[PDB]
Amino acid sequence: PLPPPSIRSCGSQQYVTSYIPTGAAFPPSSVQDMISSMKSYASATDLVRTYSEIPSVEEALSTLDRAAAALNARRYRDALKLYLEGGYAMANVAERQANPKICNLLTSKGFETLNWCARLCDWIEGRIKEKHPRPGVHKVGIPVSNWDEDWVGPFMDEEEARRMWYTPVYCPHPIDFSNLGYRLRCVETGRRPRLMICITMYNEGPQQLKATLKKLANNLAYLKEQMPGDEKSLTGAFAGDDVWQNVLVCIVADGREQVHPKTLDYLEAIGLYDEDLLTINSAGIGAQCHLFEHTLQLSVNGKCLLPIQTVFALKENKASKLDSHHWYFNAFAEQIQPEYTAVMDVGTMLTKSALYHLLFAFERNHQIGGACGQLTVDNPFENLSNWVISAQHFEYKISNILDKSLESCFGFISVLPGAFSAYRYEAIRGAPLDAYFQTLNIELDVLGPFIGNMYLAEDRILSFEVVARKNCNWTMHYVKDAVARTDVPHDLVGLISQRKRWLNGAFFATLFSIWNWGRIYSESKHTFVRKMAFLVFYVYHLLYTAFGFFLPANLYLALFFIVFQGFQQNRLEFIDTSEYSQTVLDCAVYIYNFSYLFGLLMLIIIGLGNNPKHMKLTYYFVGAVFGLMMMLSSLVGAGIFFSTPATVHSIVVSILTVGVYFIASALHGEVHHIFMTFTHYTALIPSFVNIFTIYSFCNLQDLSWETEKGDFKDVIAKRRALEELRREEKERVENRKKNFEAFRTNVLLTWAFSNLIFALFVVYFASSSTYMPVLYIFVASLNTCRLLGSIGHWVYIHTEGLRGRVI
Amino acid sequence: PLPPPSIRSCGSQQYVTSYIPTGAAFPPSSVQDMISSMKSYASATDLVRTYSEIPSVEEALSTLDRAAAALNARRYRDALKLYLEGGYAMANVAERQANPKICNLLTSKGFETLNWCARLCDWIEGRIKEKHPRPGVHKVGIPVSNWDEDWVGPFMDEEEARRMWYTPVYCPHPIDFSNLGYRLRCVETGRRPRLMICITMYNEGPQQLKATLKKLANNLAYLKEQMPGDEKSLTGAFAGDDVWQNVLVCIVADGREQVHPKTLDYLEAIGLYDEDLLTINSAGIGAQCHLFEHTLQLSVNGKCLLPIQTVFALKENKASKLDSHHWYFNAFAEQIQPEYTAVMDVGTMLTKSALYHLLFAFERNHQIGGACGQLTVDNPFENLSNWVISAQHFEYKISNILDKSLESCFGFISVLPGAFSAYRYEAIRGAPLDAYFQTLNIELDVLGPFIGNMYLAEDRILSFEVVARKNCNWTMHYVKDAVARTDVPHDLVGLISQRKRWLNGAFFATLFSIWNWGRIYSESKHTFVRKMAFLVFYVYHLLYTAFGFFLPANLYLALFFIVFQGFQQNRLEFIDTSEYSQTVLDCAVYIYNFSYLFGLLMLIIIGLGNNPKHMKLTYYFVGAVFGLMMMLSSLVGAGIFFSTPATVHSIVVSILTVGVYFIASALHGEVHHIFMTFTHYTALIPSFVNIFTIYSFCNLQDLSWETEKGDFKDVIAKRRALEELRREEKERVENRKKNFEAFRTNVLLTWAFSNLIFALFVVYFASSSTYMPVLYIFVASLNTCRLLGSIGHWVYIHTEGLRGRVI
């Protein structure tokens, strides 16, 4: 027992040294005397009280946010106190404001907060039994700021025409959207739309959204304009004068931080967004996302389009596109219960007939479980001086025609991103969607790296699940007339990144399909003929994948043998090289080999090294070298072919190898595009193969993703527990990244060394006369099969319409 | 003007829809009537009041933390209110506690907080003029928990012996440590230590720290035990019976999160840490770091060591080691103003004579601006079955002897990490330290990538700045007898990482030195003979660096030519290969080339791909292959040399190439180590060169690093400004990373392609009879120069002691 040290200025002075003896426990009387001998504090207290006299909006919002954070932490008394303080603060502040909208919104928010406080107090007392109590749902409808008086439509109720509705949601698991008591305007008003469209958006300019909305309005107008009484005309819910009431459009953004500000300005202009309402009404909830609802009316030039029922959902935090599809499908589809479900991106500009053709196919066939339309490049002929655009145009046309026709003949399509794809909401409701969202429900550690890698491009999983669903026989189909025009990158780097993601997804989806093909026979219920056809397609798929795996080696072998060994060993027919100094003959081969090897080494180093945006010059240089090489090879090959007097074998091989493209293009009426873009596509084949495959394989690493009071010892334990949990989480993340990197490295090494070993063995132990015929036979077989598939698809599409009466 | 909608249950019910008309502004009377018609809130209010009756420690600490955060944000009224609330809460809570220490600490903290509140109120009123007001400094001394009664020392004041002191500091820029009013116990008590030691620590076990402290105590004991009256004995402040008062030890940790808990337990055991004091006294300050001060007494077995004056500084957030050196040097050196300054790491176990030899050299020479001791591996002979440890032991011995002697002859040393290095605090005070910490004061964007890369290993910058300081002639020196024993990794992967950082730092420091060598002649003031000697050393340095840049190609050429082309073209002398099938002769060369190329490709892919921890098996396999190849080459070369009848040229070349190691080792008396470890080191040369250089060059990417009230529009503007600032920061970070990656990729490509092109040209346009003599001449010249340097250093060290009387 000793008096405290005589130090009354601890924070007043600059530096003070003191000694605090522990174990004495002090006398209470001395401490009380020390406390009573201080009078300055009163002044400070008075000042603080004066400062505390007046509240402010910022303080109220901050207190409400802290209350929400406490409520999420399961501490209820502190949440109640903060909620009461915030409610009283807002109620007091609301009178100061001079803007009527702010005054009304603040008054409403204060009343809601006070009612929630009363309900929470009643629950804490034990009067009401609930689990996870939350503030009640309260959607607010307000007049639209700008309204076009000079607009003519079919008919619009004033409540629907001039009021926009808003509500923030908290639902953490989207499957519980309906249980928690949320509702939509369409369901509330009694309308039951039959078709739904999802338009995912992330970091886009207003122009793309404007074009997409205009095109959708044009499609609705065309659907309305069709006359009844015809065989072609649709019957039922898609007739005229009421079509706009059976279609709903959902616009799902990805995150408030990443949204382009001009997009928000445009959305607010058309009456679908308001910052003040979001700021005020979302204070206490801690919403996961906020949804606005309207029936927007658009006017372009002097023509007024049709009204569109629109729901705009904006998520609070950035997530994957699969998360947006999860929200859309589960919440909105399970609530509305539509019949069809269309998926597209932002910027996809449809033609006037896409919806009509899709609905016509779905209604006529009754066996189609899904459909995809044709994809096209916007303005291909304009600016033909650009080679990348022309190459992409040729690739799209040929891929569509040949591959899509061949795959749609058998009734199984591997849709390529990002198409405008429609599924009927009866074949995907159960197991297929469960397998679709498996990544979002299970952490990557349990699944493994192989399962996680394939979901980067996730459409093919849905396609395969629909085709092989248990106790059902669902088949897919391809519609030629559903044309969707997109925009393509103008440079190499964006194309490289896009092809990287496409190739990763395609490769691992193909591996999964080959692994699990047996489920069609083991579980599904198809016809026997369908099973035999699927077996034949399986054999073809295996052969095609195996040939595509060894493509760089085959390209190198073909170029080397034909061109350079013809020059060296005098096999070019239009010139004789028995002369010359025996130095040029070897020099050609040496130059070719050294250039090819150095280019491959540089490309792999750069691709595995850094992002392909600050290495533009090197990629351009390598592409130019490879393009010049390919053009030289093409000219030499054409000369060699023309010089030969020709034979039946030669002409048959030439036809079945090269002319299949032109024959199939002429059969379907699209021949001029091939003529325009064949030369441009020919000069990018080595670039395509080498660069895109190497960059895709190198960057496979791109993985995605309660005590109120207390004493001192509790504080120490809490801090230690938090530190332990943080360290364990960091360790787990490290382990996951290590596993994924190891897997990608093993795959890349296997691929590269397989190609190199095959090339070396074929070069050293084979001749140019015992190898080329095998390659010719293989290529001819593949192209013959593709041509037969295309012809079969054309015959079916032009015959079934007339011959379906019998069957 | 319309009445509010009749909705009194907004959060009470599950789901309610409402319409809020904006622009009406409401009637006040209706809102007042609606408010007055509610009575449930009172119950909630009462409950809240009851819950608010009792305070708690956690609430007080949280409020103080929020007050500190507000004060850092330049808002003063909110900070004052929160500080007052926290002070009153702590004052009320202090009486509840039953633990006397907690009661006393809480009472003191409450009084300090109230005094700071009063001072801040006075400042806000305008009575006091200050800039950046902060709470006053207040260091607290408390008794040590555990005290050893059975301990005998020279003499200790009870205040110093039984009290440990603590204070948290806020100084954001360490240069202002003295201005803000902080102080140290040694300076306060009047002691003026002359020598300082810094012991950096980060994520280490207690055993290393215990061993380091025991070794330092042994060094102090040896320094005390020396007798006076001898020529060898030191004179002055380092005499006997008072040596322990002239040495201070600073232990700087790197971050509370990363510190091993057992290390904290051990530190608390010896009376240098306490969690309760840190938790309580650091609540309001928002300290950058916390420092404890003591004079610790250690006992090992039955012998009691000497007391050590220790200051333990623990930083709040993790930073680089350069940050720890910044804090140490600036704050503590500028305050204490010592004479010398020693730097070491944790785990470096000194011998009994290191300090004596260092101080002896510094006092005798009077021109030495810095010195470094010899580095050794602990227990080399024990567990000789391990090859990595033996290879490292041989490398350390040879590097020390040859390179250090040669460089110390001229008076310029490039110290290798991490040595026990001592600088006198007179040649580094000004410009050298400014150039040392240039990275910490200027962001990497202004400097560029080349400047930023070299500071990864930062000692050589200090060495060069000391050597070339303006208007001064400072030279460095190497002491052979200052032996420091460390611990080395037992596996390949840790060695790989350590060598990666070492090689990056060494390469870029060497480039900087070669770039800026001219400053010695342009600015410094040396003797003419010194300038000529530095010119000669510059020529030698350029030649050595140029030879070392092209090492992999030379190794490949030597192995290939000698061994495999001797086997193929019958040049092995102990066997004739004119027989055989002409298939084996080519097969040997083909196998060698293919294996070498495949190994290099795999190594570069793995090194650039992933972290070298989950690729252990592949690295081990490649190392084993290269080791077997090197052993075969060594045996073949030994046989070839022994078979030859020999000549003057042959014996001279053999001596000057290989036997220089043994001659120099025998000259200095350390010969058995070479005999033991030569075989182990021979089998790791290709592994060293290839693996370490490739991994070092691949991973060069490793870069490091106010309105109180308000209205609504201010809130919106604040949110928009914060979003804009965040996006700009993200863009800047992206740009910096892009630039660094591009630089590293360019350097790697240059190195690899230079080596490959040189190798190809020499293989194709040269013979094994017109190339090997040049290589022999080059290697012989370099080794002759190194041997001459070593002999000169030995002669100087054994002669100057006797011959210094004349000069």
Author numbering:
A (entry chain B), B (entry chain A): 38 to 742, 759 to 860
Question: Which of the paper's sentences describe this entry?
Answer:
The core of the chitin biosynthetic machinery is an integral membrane enzyme named chitin synthase (CHS) (EC 2.4.1.16). Here we report five cryo-electron microscopy structures of a chitin synthase from the devastating soybean root rot pathogenic oomycete Phytophthora sojae (PsChs1).
The apo structure of PsChs1 is the first example of a membrane-integrated processive glycosyltransferase with an apparently continuous but empty transmembrane channel, providing a real off-state of the enzyme before chitin synthesis is initiated. Our PsChs1 structures revealed that the entrance to this channel is blocked by the swinging loop, specifically residue Pro454, in the apo and substrate-bound states, but it is open in the (GlcNAc)3-bound state. Molecular dynamics simulations of the apo and UDP/(GlcNAc)3-bound states of PsChs1 suggested that the VLPGA motif also acts as a permeability barrier that prevents water flux across the membrane in the apo state. The two PsChs1 protomers are related to each other by a twofold rotation around an axis perpendicular to the membrane. TM5 is an extraordinarily long helix (approximately 80 Å in length) that spans from the TM domain to the cytosolic region and projects into the opposite protomer like a sword. Two NTDs from the two PsChs1 protomers are wrapped by each other to form a symmetric and domain-swapped interface.
